Amino acid sequence: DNIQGITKPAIRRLARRGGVKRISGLIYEETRGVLKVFLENVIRDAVTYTEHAKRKTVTAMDVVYALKRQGRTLYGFG
Amino acid sequence: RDNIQGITKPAIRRLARRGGVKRISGLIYEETRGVLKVFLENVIRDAVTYTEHAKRKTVTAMDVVYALKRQGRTLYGFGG
Amino acid sequence: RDNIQGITKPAIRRLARRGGVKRISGLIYEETRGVLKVFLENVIRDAVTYTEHAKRKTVTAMDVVYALKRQGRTLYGFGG
Amino acid sequence: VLRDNIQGITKPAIRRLARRGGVKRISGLIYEETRGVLKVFLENVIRDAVTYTEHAKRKTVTAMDVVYALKRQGRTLYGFG
Amino acid sequence: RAKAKSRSSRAGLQFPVGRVHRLLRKGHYAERVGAGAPVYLAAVLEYLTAEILELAGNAARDNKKTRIIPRHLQLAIRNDEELNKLLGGVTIAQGGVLPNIQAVLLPK
Amino acid sequence: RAKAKSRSSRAGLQFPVGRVHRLLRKGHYAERVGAGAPVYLAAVLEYLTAEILELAGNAARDNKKTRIIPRHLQLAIRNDEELNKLLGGVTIAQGGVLPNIQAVLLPK
Amino acid sequence: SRKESYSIYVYKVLKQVHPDTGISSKAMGIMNSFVNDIFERIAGEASRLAHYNKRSTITSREIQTAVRLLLPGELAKHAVSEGTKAVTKYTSA
Amino acid sequence: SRKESYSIYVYKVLKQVHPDTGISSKAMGIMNSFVNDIFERIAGEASRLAHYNKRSTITSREIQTAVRLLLPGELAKHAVSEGTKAVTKYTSA
Amino acid sequence: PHRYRPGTVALREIRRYQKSTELLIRKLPFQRLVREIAQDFKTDLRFQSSAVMALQEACEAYLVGLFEDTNLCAIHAKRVTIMPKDIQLARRIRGE
Numbered sequence: 001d002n003i004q005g006i007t008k009p010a011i012r013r014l015a016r017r018g019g020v021k022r023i024s025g026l027i028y029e030e031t032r033g034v035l036k037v038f039l040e041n042v043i044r045d046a047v048t049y050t051e052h053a054k055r056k057t058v059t060a061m062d063v064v065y066a067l068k069r070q071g072r073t074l075y076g077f078g
Numbered sequence: 079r080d081n082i083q084g085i086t087k088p089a090i091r092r093l094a095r096r097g098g099v100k101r102i103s104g105l106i107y108e109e110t111r112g113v114l115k116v117f118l119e120n121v122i123r124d125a126v127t128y129t130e131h132a133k134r135k136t137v138t139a140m141d142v143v144y145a146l147k148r149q150g151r152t153l154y155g156f157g158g
Numbered sequence: 159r160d161n162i163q164g165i166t167k168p169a170i171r172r173l174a175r176r177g178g179v180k181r182i183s184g185l186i187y188e189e190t191r192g193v194l195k196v197f198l199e200n201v202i203r204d205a206v207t208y209t210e211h212a213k214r215k216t217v218t219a220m221d222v223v224y225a226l227k228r229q230g231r232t233l234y235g236f237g238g
Numbered sequence: 239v240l241r242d243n244i245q246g247i248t249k250p251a252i253r254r255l256a257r258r259g260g261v262k263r264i265s266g267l268i269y270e271e272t273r274g275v276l277k278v279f280l281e282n283v284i285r286d287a288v289t290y291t292e293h294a295k296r297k298t299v300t301a302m303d304v305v306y307a308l309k310r311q312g313r314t315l316y317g318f319g
Numbered sequence: 320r321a322k323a324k325s326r327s328s329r330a331g332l333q334f335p336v337g338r339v340h341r342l343l344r345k346g347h348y349a350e351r352v353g354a355g356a357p358v359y360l361a362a363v364l365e366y367l368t369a370e371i372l373e374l375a376g377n378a379a380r381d382n383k384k385t386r387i388i389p390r391h392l393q394l395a396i397r398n399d400e401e402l403n404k405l406l407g408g409v410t411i412a413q414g415g416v417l418p419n420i421q422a423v424l425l426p427k
Numbered sequence: 428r429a430k431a432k433s434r435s436s437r438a439g440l441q442f443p444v445g446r447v448h449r450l451l452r453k454g455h456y457a458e459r460v461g462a463g464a465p466v467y468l469a470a471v472l473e474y475l476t477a478e479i480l481e482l483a484g485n486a487a488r489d490n491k492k493t494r495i496i497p498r499h500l501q502l503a504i505r506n507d508e509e510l511n512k513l514l515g516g517v518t519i520a521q522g523g524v525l526p527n528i529q530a531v532l533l534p535k
Numbered sequence: 536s537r538k539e540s541y542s543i544y545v546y547k548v549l550k551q552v553h554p555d556t557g558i559s560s561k562a563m564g565i566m567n568s569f570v571n572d573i574f575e576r577i578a579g580e581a582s583r584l585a586h587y588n589k590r591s592t593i594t595s596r597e598i599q600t601a602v603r604l605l606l607p608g609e610l611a612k613h614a615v616s617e618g619t620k621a622v623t624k625y626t627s628a
Numbered sequence: 629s630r631k632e633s634y635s636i637y638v639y640k641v642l643k644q645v646h647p648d649t650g651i652s653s654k655a656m657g658i659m660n661s662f663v664n665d666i667f668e669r670i671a672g673e674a675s676r677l678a679h680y681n682k683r684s685t686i687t688s689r690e691i692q693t694a695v696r697l698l699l700p701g702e703l704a705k706h707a708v709s710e711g712t713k714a715v716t717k718y719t720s721a
Numbered sequence: 722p723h724r725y726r727p728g729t730v731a732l733r734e735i736r737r738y739q740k741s742t743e744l745l746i747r748k749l750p751f752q753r754l755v756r757e758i759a760q761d762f763k764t765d766l767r768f769q770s771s772a773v774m775a776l777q778e779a780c781e782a783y784l785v786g787l788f789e790d791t792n793l794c795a796i797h798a799k800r801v802t803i804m805p806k807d808i809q810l811a812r813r814i815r816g817e
Contacts, residue, residue: 017416021424075568076389076412076561124604131600132588144587148604161757164750172745173781174803175738176524177788179795180532180731181802189805190784193812197783198758201776206762216767217759222775231783234661235497235520235654236775286697293693294681306680310697330625331439333547342574343593348582351592358625359598359618360577364570366614369548371566376553387558392565401607409572411565438718441640446632450667451686456675459685463715467691468670470714471707472663477641478703479659484646495642495651497658498742509700517665518782519658523742528735531796534728554709616647 003032042066082111121145162191201225247273283307327361334361374399389413434466442469482507497521540567577601595622633660670694688715744777751777787811 011031015023045066050058060077067074090110094102124145129137143158170190174182204225209217219236226233252272256264286307291299301318308315326336340357374395375387382391393414396402434444447465480495482503487495501522504510545566549558558566580601585593599618603611638659642651673694674686692711696704738745752773759766787808794807 019420019424071408072410073408073572074410074412075565075572078564078568127600127603131584131596159757161750161754164747164754166747166750169746172738173784174788175731175734176745177785177792178528178532178735178739179788179792179803180728180735183802183804185805186803186808189808193787193808194780194784195758197780198755198776201779202755202759203762205772206759206766209766210763215765216769217772218769219771219775222772222779226779230516231779232517232665233520233775233779234517234658234665235778236771238661238664289693289697293677293689326625329628330621332621333544334541335544339574343578346578348578349585349591349593353592353594355595355622355625356581356593356598358621359595360574362618362621363577363598363602363614364573365548366617367573367610368545368566368570369552371569372545372549372558373552375562376549376556379556385556387556387562389559389561389565392562401609404607405610413561434718437721438714440714441637442634443637447667451671454671456671457678457684457686461685461687463688463718464674464686464691466714466718467688467711468667470711471670471691471695472666473641474707474710475666475703476638476659476663477645479662480638480642480645483655484642484649487649488646493648493650495649495655497654500655500658509703512700513698513703517662518779520778521654521742524739524785526736526739528732529792529796532801533732551713555705612648616644620644 334365438466440469
């Protein structure tokens with residue numbers, strides 16, 4: 001159970017970058033669930049591309065393609 | 079021209095009724111007309127662009143299907 | 159002659175308004191006329207000198223452009 | 239490198255210059271404004287002098303370079319040839 | 320065999336017309352590719368690159384810097400109404416957000 | 428005899444290299460004129476000409492017009508802190524003045 | 536082995552727009568991926584237009600129509616102007 | 629008699645910077661005078677610079693120095709790059 | 722009837738004439754004045770239609786610039802009305 005590794009201070013800092021002035025005490029568990037759901041959909045795709053190539057090492061390109069298919073093209077990692 | 083007035087108030091009411099809206103404030107109509115005009119303009123510009131590439135003078139249903147297809151909405155039943 | 163009186167008070171007011179002056183004292187007019195007269199005299203003396211050197215009898219726009227150029231101010235739009 | 243020498247233009251010299259000009263009473267803030275004006279004035283002349291010096295490929299700044307630099311701004315100075 | 324000279328020089332372009340032509344043929348977009356397609360596409364790409372670099376370079380001087388970094392590109396893109404429309408969905412690493420606070424949140 | 432090709436085409440410039448070379452010889456500025464002087468001077472004039480036209484066109488577009496007129500040249504020159512230094516002593520016919528009013532004169 | 540990127544051409548253009556400024560490797564990586572993105576969009580749209588008309592070749596007409604569709608109204612006018620200038624100079628060379 | 633002017637060249641530049649925009653006759657006359665003005669200023673300074681060094685020929689170095697002396701800093705910084713590139717390309721041809 | 726307070730119209734005129742572009746001097750009076758002054762140097766002179774316009778544009782620009790400078794000198798003395806001594810001071814400082 002490593003979901004507890006996303007500590008409360010990090011959540012506050014992220015809300016601060018977004019301009020949030022005051023945060024209710026229940027936002028943390030919802031944010032944890034949202035992050036877990038977002039990660040699962042990307043990881044499943046990355047693993048799918050990795051397996052098709054018969055490689056055992058996950059590569060940056062696999063994540064780049066996985067994000068592009070959902071429309072979240074990421075610039076910077078080649 | 080005045081043709082924008084052709085989308086009468088009752089048509090807007092029936093459309094809002096289909097969406098389940100129970101009570102509608104009297105100012106929603108002008109906003110809806112403005113919102114509709116920009117969509118039509120956007121679709122027609124692409125349609126006319128496709129028509130012009132083909133050197134045709136009549137605009138066909140296929141050009142409208144492709145315009146909607148590019149904007150990200152697909153229409154079933156007219157062809158394609 | 160009386161031709162100096164042809165620069166009526168309203169023309170001076172319009173010029174002062176373009177310069178942003180909000181209130182004008184009644185004695186500014188004779189000083190402005192005196193200041194303008196010496197400037198015109200200075201420019202015309204040079205223009206006429208250039209005209210006379212060329213043996214012409216008509217004074218052309220080039221002679222005025224060169225007079226202003228010698229006084230240190232350049233005019234764009236009439237030639238040269 | 240000299241980190242700072244412009245402090246070397248002393249208050250008494252500025253008062254004496256104002257005296258040559260006929261200034262009777264001087265406010266206490268005139269000194270820093272005068273220093274800023276003089277520095278701004280010197281930069282514009284030095285940049286041109288150096289420009290002529292570099293064009294000639296010389297390494298020594300010469301009086302003539304300053305004379306020409308001053309002449310371009312319209313301040314012909316008589317006495318130095 | 321006359322002395323060869325590059326097509327990019329003839330058109331007056333910096334991008335490689337030969338490489339773009341190769342990439343079109345190897346992409347299987349169509350079985351035949353005309354002569355004018357690559358020159359036009361190269362000219363368009365050069366224009367868009369020059370506009371981005373110009374705006375980023377102007378943004379750099381405002382920070383007394385002399386080297387371009389991702390933060391300046393992000394500030395250049397999110398500040399232009401045309402570039403922002405073409406790049407509304409692209410995410411740039413290390414870019415951060417633009418400074419903005421809703422007036423309701425500021426002190427009374 | 429090879430087919431003639433203009434020097435402007437070789438350098439890639441629009442201004443006439445031959446005309447500038449002719450003017451330099453006829454003005455008696457010096458007894459000999461090097462081959463590189465006219466190309467450099469033409470390039471500088473072309474840069475400055477385009478630099479002014481761009482600002483004029485942007486002003487014209489803001490004014491919702493399609494033809495550039497002297498008023499737009501005046502507004503372009505007087506709003507730039509560097510052009511205003513090079514063209515401080517020049518007057519443009521029908522240029523007018525920039526709107527400006529002293530704060531002390533406005534009503535309380 | 537031998538890799539391929541546009542960093543050289545981005546540098547040549549940079550020295551023409553601003554001859555006194557440099558660019559960091561992090562900005563260069565973003566500029567290199569941006570070009571590959573726009574290249575793929577234009578070639579994609581041009582191929583679709585060519586297939587609907589039942590044509591075997593891609594020509595400047597396809598590029599022009601795609602450019603008018605993908606790029607906003609203001610970028611298209613300028614881009615098309617210089618594209619036609621380039622084609623005219625090449626054909627007249 | 630025939631009068632020479634730069635009007636066609638000014639129009640070509642305007643069409644390159646703004647293809648949809650046009651220019652009235654008065655603007656053409658103003659630009660045509662402005663070009664001759666700057667021409668005389670640069671040629672004048674180049675002439676003074678030639679005599680102080682006892683040289684009999686005007687060269688690109690005289691033009692570069694005159695440009696740095698007359699134009700303000702940033703304008704000179706860009707213009708010198710334009711001239712250097714132009715001369716380099718011309719000589720390379 | 723409605724009446725504007727003193728200065729409202731002055732500001733309106735300032736905005737109007739700052740936004741406009743036409744010439745402000747009457748063509749005929751200026752042409753007669755030019756023909757009068759020139760007569761002292763040489764008789765029976767003739768002038769082209771564009772020379773009078775060039776002189777008019779130069780004179781109008783010169784006066785506008787002098788009034789702009791005089792306005793600063795007026796505010797410095799905490800006054801609003803410009804006076805002859807202000808012009809005399811501006812001209813003396815300019816070195817004319």
